[PDB]
């Protein structure tokens, strides 16, 4: 249950925590094999820290997403039992908010909204680019209720930066 | 285990080629011919570009006798155009055997 809702100036994730931040303005949500997921998260976090502090500027959410897709493809390719699904919520200084859906096979896809089916169906029923934070929290609550009928702790990556929001 | 039966067959194709060549020469010519050929190959390989650049290895192919031959390794994947590259000093150290 990792529900993400991209918005005008934020990206409200909702983990089941799974929220392993890579750097400022970047938040990666990893789900799958317990051992592989955290190891991959740590590896990518170290790589992005290296890039940040070697170049003086951090990888943008798009660049981080692409690099993570490449690395995840390699990792699955190096060892088959590396079933690791990702959800990279982040904010870009120029681009703005950026949510990124990616399956275990490292198929990156920018997502107006994402989840890792019942949760996605509720988002499909109701979603708007011009959405507010409280509206996204309500959406997450509805998706969680639908999934239960069939946690949701949320953070946002705002232009200010990563924030901790009331757990749902 | 490998990812394919041919994986190791072609990871070490050249190694096996030279091994069989030297075995045959030892059996027929004697000890001197493999020694001489090893010396020439070593001498030509000692001098080339650093590992982080693409060496031509021209004179090595001329000695080997495949300077006018084409194989799938020549065309399929081109080491001259690599997609991931390590640091220069790092790979030179690796080649020297320090790491």
């Amino acid at each position: 249950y990792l529900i993400g809702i991209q918005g005008p100036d934020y990206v409200l994730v909702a983990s089941d925590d799974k929220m392993f931040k890579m750097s400022e303005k970047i938040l990666l949500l990893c789900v799958g094999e317990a051992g592989d997921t955290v190891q991959f998260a740590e590896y990518i976090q170290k790589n992005v820290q290296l890039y940040k502090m070697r170049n003086g500027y951090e990888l943008s959410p798009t660049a981080a997403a692409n690099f993570t897709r490449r690395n995840l493809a390699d990792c699955l390719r190096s060892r088959t039992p590396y079933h690791v699904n990702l959800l990279l919520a982040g904010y870009d200084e120029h681009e703005g908010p950026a949510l990124y859906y990616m399956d275990y096979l490292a198929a990156l896809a920018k997502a107006p909204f994402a989840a890792h089916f019942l949760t996605l169906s509720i988002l499909d029923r109701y979603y708007t680019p011009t959405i507010s934070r409280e509206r996204a929290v309500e959406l997450l609550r509805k998706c969680l209720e639908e999934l239960q009928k069939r946690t949701f702790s949320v953070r946002i990556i705002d232009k200010n930066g990563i924030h901790d929001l009331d757990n749902i | 285990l490998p990812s394919h039966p041919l994986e190791l067959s072609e990871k070490n194709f050249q190694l096996n080629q030279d091994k069989m060549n030297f075995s045959t020469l030892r059996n027929i010519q004697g000890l001197f011919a493999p020694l001489k050929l090893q010396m020439e190959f070593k001498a030509v390989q000692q001098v080339q570009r650093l590992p982080f650049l693409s060496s031509s290895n021209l004179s090595l192919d001329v000695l080997r006798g495949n300077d006018e031959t084409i194989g799938f390794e020549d065309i399929l994947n081109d080491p001259s155009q690599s997609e991931v590259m390590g640091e220069p000093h790092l790979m030179v150290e690796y080649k020297l055997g320090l790491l």
Partner: protein, 219 residues
């Protein structure tokens, strides 16, 4: 940048293989729909006669190796085009060094050795036919690297009927028009379609279309 020490190399990459096999196992039971290989399942034929070689490919499957060497193709397509192209380049280099036309024995040896090195994991069931200094030769390449220099040889879909036609209707040292009519008869049996007889002679419902996103980019 990091975690890369050994210098680059060239050749086939077998990295995709393991994940590919596991995913095929997954798709086999749920999902299916995996791309397959277009293959040269058609029949090919070839005969050797008095003044050269004649090959048949209903399909074309004939492949230029040298000006005096040609090769039919059966089995898998991409494999056979790549194999024929590589051996053609090798023989072109050999000819450039020689100043002489390449020999059919050289082509047969190259194909045999390369295909045996690949251990028949690439499907190139070929009928190598040409003329050289020695004379007309008709080899029969196999994916695993086995060659037979027979008066007539066939392989493919209807190759057995073509072989029967060759056996019944062949006489030693045919002539030009007789040889290319026997191969046509044998290759015609494989069909039972235009055939590329390669004679290597020694002497020579209005759906609803509602646009949503229309954009232009003047060039």
């Amino acid at each position: 940048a990091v975690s890369v020490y050994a210098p680059p190399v060239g050749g086939f990459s077998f990295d995709n293989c393991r994940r590919n096999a596991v995913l095929e196992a997954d798709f086999a039971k749920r999902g299916y729909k995996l791309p397959k290989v277009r293959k040269t399942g058609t029949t090919i034929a070839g005969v050797v006669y008095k003044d050269g070689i004649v090959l048949g490919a209903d399909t074309s499957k004939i492949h230029f190796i040298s000006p005096n060497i040609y090769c039919c193709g059966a089995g898998t397509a991409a494999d056979t085009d790549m194999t024929t192209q590589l051996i053609s380049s090798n023989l072109e280099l050999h000819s450039l060094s020689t100043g002489r036309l390449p020999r059919v024995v050289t082509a047969n040896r190259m194909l045999k050795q390369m295909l045996f090195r690949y251990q028949g994991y690439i499907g190139a069931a070929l009928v190598l036919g040409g003329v050289d200094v020695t004379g007309p030769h008709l080899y029969s390449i196999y994916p695993h690297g086995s060659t037979d220099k027979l008066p007539y040889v066939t392989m493919g879909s209807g190759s057995l009927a073509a072989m029967a036609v060759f056996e019944d209707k062949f006489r030693p040292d045919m002539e030009e028009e007789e040889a290319k009519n026997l191969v046509s008869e044998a290759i015609a049996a494989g069909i039972f379609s235009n055939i590329d007889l390669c004679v290597i002679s020694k002497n020579k419902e209005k759906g609803t279309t509602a646009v949503l996103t229309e954009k232009i980019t003047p060039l």
